[PDB]
Swiss-Prot record, chain A:
Location(s), subcellular: Virion
Gene: 8.5
Function field: Protein that forms the 55 capsid fibers. These fibers are not always present and may have been lost in some lab strains. They may enhance the attachment of the virions onto the host cell wall.
Superkingdom of origin organism: Viruses
Protein name: Capsid fiber protein
Family: Belongs to the phi29likevirus major capsid fiber protein family.
Organism the protein comes from: Bacillus phage phi29 (Bacteriophage phi-29)
Quaternary structure and partners: Homotrimer. Forms a super helix coiled coil in the homotrimer.
Swiss-Prot record, chain D:
Oligomeric form and interacting partners: Homohexamer. Homopentamer. The prolate capsid is composed of pentamers and hexamers of the capsid protein.
Places the protein is found: Virion
Function summary: Assembles to form a prolate capsid shell of about 54 nm in length and 45 nm in width, with a T=3, Q=5 symmetry.
UniProt-recorded name of the protein: Major capsid protein
Organism listed in the record: Bacillus phage phi29 (Bacteriophage phi-29)
Family: Belongs to the phi29likevirus major capsid protein family.
Gene symbol of the encoding locus: 8
Listed transmembrane segments: none
Swiss-Prot record, chain G:
Protein name (record): Capsid fiber protein
Subcellular location field: Virion
Subunit structure, as described in the record: Homotrimer. Forms a super helix coiled coil in the homotrimer.
Similarity annotation: Belongs to the phi29likevirus major capsid fiber protein family.
Upper classification of the organism: Viruses, Duplodnaviria, Heunggongvirae, Uroviricota, Caudoviricetes
Boundaries of the shown chain within the full protein: 3 to 113 of 280
Entry function: Protein that forms the 55 capsid fibers. These fibers are not always present and may have been lost in some lab strains. They may enhance the attachment of the virions onto the host cell wall.
Organism of origin: Bacillus phage phi29 (Bacteriophage phi-29)
Residue runs in coiled coils: none
Length: 112, 445, 99, 97, 438, 50, 111
């Protein structure tokens, strides 16, 4: 994979959808805003001032926290706190569920 | 292969002796001025790293040969292998048990009528060692490609033997560093009995004041009645003078060697009185001259296994030499670290058998053993952090739990040192589980 | 009457995975869904809906793998819970975000 | 029967050798840097007070066991036994004159 | 208590017992201590000694459970093949009696009466191995004796063996269902057994009627799937049935309760867990109906030097197939077709050009009615046809391979459902002339 | 219950016996330093000041 | 990785596919005309048949051509899951790097 250094700027939690921004000579990361398309997924807790890395790779699927109950095949978007939630507005869809998840459980997703 | 290169490759060259200096001044470098071939000797006379195919000076088609191959061999041995104590095939943990002395009672025939079958528990402290390291030394020898690099068979074998001796040296280098690490672990965890000294390097009085504390502690460790202090478990134990091992480094020897012994008509009276061994380490700060019993080291062995595989497709062997050991420190042996510099007022507060296991409504006295460094202060403050509503320790160590006591308790022996505005505490701890009483319980009159 | 988790004692690295398996002693002849749940604290360690644990990189605490079956009904919950204990191996060789 | 005891029980952590090795910059812990398992030496290399069940690394259900019991035997002696004079079973009083 | 879901606390139930059922544990002492470590701790918290508290109560006995998971169907195995792939299972059948005639005998001293011999062809089809890894050096911590160390190492090899007996059971449940998925059992329609006490008597009747019919020393043709006069033995029948019907039958009937330990009354009753297909309530087979052989039993190991483990591989190659020559009956409930199969004639032939081979369709019907067989000839290019009684008649310049079919059409006249029985017929050339006749 | 060895169990029961005699050696040493400190407290030592 | 799909209605190899959902398991059918497909069939799959979707993120696909495709042409879904040229962005799912007649397979790079 291709790794690079990035700094959290707002208490990154594991399995949350992440977004990024241009900071002080470094890419800064945080939980993705509600109702959008995320760029990266957390797989480690990284606090507000903590420095970490990002492992680049065209992953087939992500495992993220379900922000609500999810049915197999549901199109997903970002929700509160960077969780993944069911939707129906194409422009905010970043992937879809291949398995059932209850709120708070991990849900595997396939990118689109 | 390689194209051109400089001759100075890894050379930083503080000053150029060749042209910038020897050709330059009429100074002390006049002894090197008349040498005709000095500019060549100063050039490649440190050795070179990349070999060129230098041609021959007359028949330019010929090449110049390697006239000699000097395989240089080293043998590395652990200076601390005499402290190693054995091997364990099966199992992981070591149960080292100490039994301690007990207390006298008075003779009385009238009371003895009713207390024949009364019982008194022994005083038994145990400690525990378990397996620590698991490592291996990978090595690979590709014998058939290495035949291109030699001309003699007698050099080919002495080189392939040398790589087998690159492990078995590294197994002795890393074992030594692990046995030094047990010393610095034991000082960092704060468990030596520190005798505060001065730095002996500074003044020769401070050296001679150090020999006095060295011989005193050695005489104190070997008093036949034994002594409660000088170890971390705080039992009465007695060392043997042939079993004390003073572990100094090489600098502190030459202080004693040049200053103290050189000017000693009676050498045995300022001697270190131990089996003096020499290191170059201790790594921390002010730590030097660790004076231990030989039972202090609990280094055992678990596996010495050389396992080989051969890749047949690519003509090489892998040499995985596994070393598994139990590298630990007994606290039932007694150990002194003469630490120079500034040390705290109290290093540790040793408490009672830390497994008390008291019944509800029972009592247990907890004895504090303050390892003070200087002379005197330091009343102990007691505490019953843990369960409550009935659990109350006195100014001495009596616990007096409860009828309602359920959770395990943490009996703390707190000693306040230093500043009243930022109170540095040396807190020794003791654990006690609470088993139910089941008689004289429920409600009460 | 019982939910038996597949491995009571597990040992998962920082970032490793471990499948667990729910074994429902259903005394009737009906199907019962197992809710999976992971408690234990430190970081965002969660589990998949079918039982695959994904310990999250900075997990220091002793985990706990719950397996819940709701017998009873709505507003009268009876929650038969199975239990598995996970310790962590410190494989502190990783990164943060991943895409 | 104990529920939770960590290995720093009653331990003053004077300089925390793990940070003294892995955050070394040039200092005298340079030689502990090439050591592969210093963290497993520095954690429990000072003797454990209260035993704790250690699960087997390969099969996590087996319990690693006790391989040796070293019953430490120490003899103490009276130094002043040479000043002892004798033994007297009969009578009670000793009269110097 | 780790994952324990209580129904009640027995400690409260005995202490608060003012005279009820728990009054037998009131005279007991230490019932609380049996109430705690009764079911057995899962994680083994270290327990101190009771007198000298610093000492540790040590593990005193390792008990390694050595349960062997055996195969019920292992007695149906028939040996081993070290070299080879296939098995040529052949069978000669009955010829017809002729009447002693001295006057006819003059011109028929050398008459050819061809034997009726049929084949089946099995093949190695199971190639599966097993895998277990043993880290012998890191397991030496978990043991104190060398006997307990080695008995645990041998426990894992037998767990491979328990695994091999698991899978070869499951393939032989698959060999039955495969054979019933293709309509090759002879099907007895039953009522659903658990609906009625009377439909349990109708079950044991239709089974023991069949067990007497299968082991008729007469022989019959009506039960093997190649329609061959053959025989079962009563000590070789094997009722392969689930546990659920087996308990219903040996209680409600009271004819099986009198005969639960008997070798007759179908007998050699092999309880299974149950069949995967739907109406397959029971299977009555011969012991020769299975032809499980063993082509390989290897245990190749390998050492990892870097990781200090042994790595075991255990290879099982078998020949898992069944024999159609043996007697085999499925007892089937549900919606059952009127005919399962048309078993056909000599299934292969080499009829010469201008020759004739009489074929015989055997219709394994379930409704006990009389169905019509419709003979037809597919393949070929030169107008080869067949009569209605099954007489193929190769034309005389026929060159292609012929495939003669015998259909029943148990369906309806608006939506047919044909049960086609098939037999392929090759052609030998004939140099005779022919061409037209009168 | 604390030993799985008879060779260790009779080394620890024999060890408790030696802790009795070490209790005798230690106390009898302390009783003989007690006779010295008693004789000082009563002032029956002649006293040389240094 | 991969996941179970339940097909939906007679999937043919090399045709462009799209996902949906019904009872539970993701349903697969031929992608509708003039849009962006989700997956390429590797083999024929019966109407209600369960199968796998091999998610091994490919940069390029081999897809049956529904019409004459030239090198560099932007492609979209055609009829019956075939790939056809398009001049209308948003319907584009990739482009050809090969030339193909009709019914021939064409390699295309997804974009």
């Amino acid at each position: 994979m291709v790794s690079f250094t990035a700094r959290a700027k707002s208490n990154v939690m594991a399995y949350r959808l992440l977004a990024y921004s241009q900071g002080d000579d470094i890419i800064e990361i945080s939980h993705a805003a509600e109702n959008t398309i995320p760029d990266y997924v957390a797989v480690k807790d990284v606090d507000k001032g903590d420095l970490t890395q990002v492992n680049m790779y065209p992953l087939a699927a992500w495992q993220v926290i379900a922000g609500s109950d999810i049915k197999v095949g549901d199109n997903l978007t970002t929700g509160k706190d960077g969780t993944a939630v069911p939707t129906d507005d194409p422009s905010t869809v970043f992937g879809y569920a291949v398995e059932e998840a209850q709120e708070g459980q991990l849900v595997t997703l396939v990118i689109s | 292969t390689f194209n051109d290169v400089k001759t100075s490759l890894g050379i930083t060259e503080s000053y150029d002796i060749v042209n910038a200096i020897r050709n330059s001044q009429g100074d002390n470098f006049k002894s090197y001025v008349p040498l005709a071939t000095a500019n060549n000797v100063a050039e490649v006379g440190a050795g070179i790293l990349i070999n060129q195919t230098v041609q021959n000076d007359f028949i330019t088609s010929l090449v110049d040969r390697i006239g000699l191959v000097v395989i240089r061999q080293v043998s590395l041995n652990n200076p601390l292998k005499k402290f190693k104590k054995g091997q364990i095939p099966l199992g992981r943990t070591i149960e080292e048990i100490y039994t301690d002395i007990t207390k006298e009672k008075q003779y009385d025939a009238e009371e003895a009528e009713q207390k024949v079958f009364e019982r008194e528990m022994p005083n038994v402290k145990t400690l525990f060692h378990e397996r620590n390291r698991q490592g291996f030394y990978h090595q690979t020898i590709q014998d058939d490609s290495l035949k291109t690099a030699f001309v003699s068979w007698g050099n080919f074998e002495s080189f392939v033997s040398s790589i087998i001796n690159a492990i078995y040296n590294s197994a002795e280098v890393d074992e030594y560093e692990y046995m030094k690490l047990l010393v610095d672990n034991y000082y960092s965890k704060g468990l030596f009995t520190t005798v505060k000294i001065d730095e002996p390097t500074s003044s020769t009085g401070a050296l001679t004041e150090f020999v006095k504390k060295m011989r005193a502690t050695a005489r104190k460790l070997t008093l036949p009645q034994g002594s409660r202090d000088w170890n971390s478990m705080a039992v009465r134990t007695r060392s043997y003078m042939e079993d004390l091992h003073l572990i100094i480094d090489a600098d502190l020897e030459a202080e004693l060697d040049v200053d103290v012994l050189a000017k000693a008509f009676n050498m045995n009276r300022t001697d270190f009185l131990g089996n003096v061994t020499v290191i170059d380490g201790f790594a921390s700060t002010g730590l030097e001259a660790v004076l231990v019993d030989k039972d202090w080291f609990m280094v055992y062995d678990n596996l010495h296994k050389m396992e080989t595989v051969r890749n047949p497709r690519g003509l090489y062997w892998n040499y995985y030499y596994h070393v598994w050991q139990t590298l630990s420190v007994s606290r039932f042996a007694n150990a002194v670290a003469f630490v120079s510099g500034d040390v705290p007022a109290v290093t540790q507060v040793i408490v009672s058998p830390n497994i008390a296991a008291v019944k509800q409504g029972g009592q247990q006295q907890f004895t504090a053993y303050v390892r003070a460094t200087n002379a005197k202060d330091h009343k102990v403050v007691w505490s019953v952090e843990g369960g409550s509503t009935g659990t109350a320790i006195t100014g001495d160590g009596l616990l007096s739990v409860s009828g309602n006591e359920d959770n395990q308790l943490t009996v703390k022996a707190t000693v306040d040192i230093g500043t009243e505005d930022k109170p540095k505490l040396v807190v020794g701890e003791a654990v006690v589980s609470i088993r139910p009483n089941n008689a004289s319980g429920g409600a009460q009159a």
